[PDB]
Amino acid sequence: XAXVXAXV
Amino acid sequence: XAXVXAXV
DNA sequence: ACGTACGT
DNA sequence: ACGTACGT
Ligand SMILES: *C(=O)c1cnc2ccccc2n1
Ligand SMILES: *C(=O)c1cnc2ccccc2n1
Ligand SMILES: *C(=O)c1cnc2ccccc2n1
């Protein structure tokens, strides 16, 4: 759920 | 992510 | 269930 | 002169 590199 | 010239 | 982020 | 960055 976090988006820092994918943002699921 | 390394920073040795840009640091991203 | 998911990888993005640069230049001296 | 090289890899760090999170939870809905
Ligand atoms: C977001 O909160 C989140 C948490 N755990 C994960 C595990 C695997 C893929 C994506 C995920 N996203
Ligand atoms: C994004 O591509 C990405 C990859 N790995 C991680 C590990 C820990 C926190 C955040 C991350 N983000
Ligand atoms: C940092 O770990 C890192 C890794 N690969 C990259 C590629 C392109 C721009 C920035 C990057 N940063």
Ligand SMILES: *C(=O)c1cnc2ccccc2n1
């Ligand atoms: C910084 O500007 C920079 C440019 N190219 C590189 C190549 C290899 C290692 C580190 C680098 N840093």
Ligand SMILES: [Mn+2]
């Ligand atoms: Mn991963």
Ligand SMILES: [Mn+2]
């Ligand atoms: Mn987790």
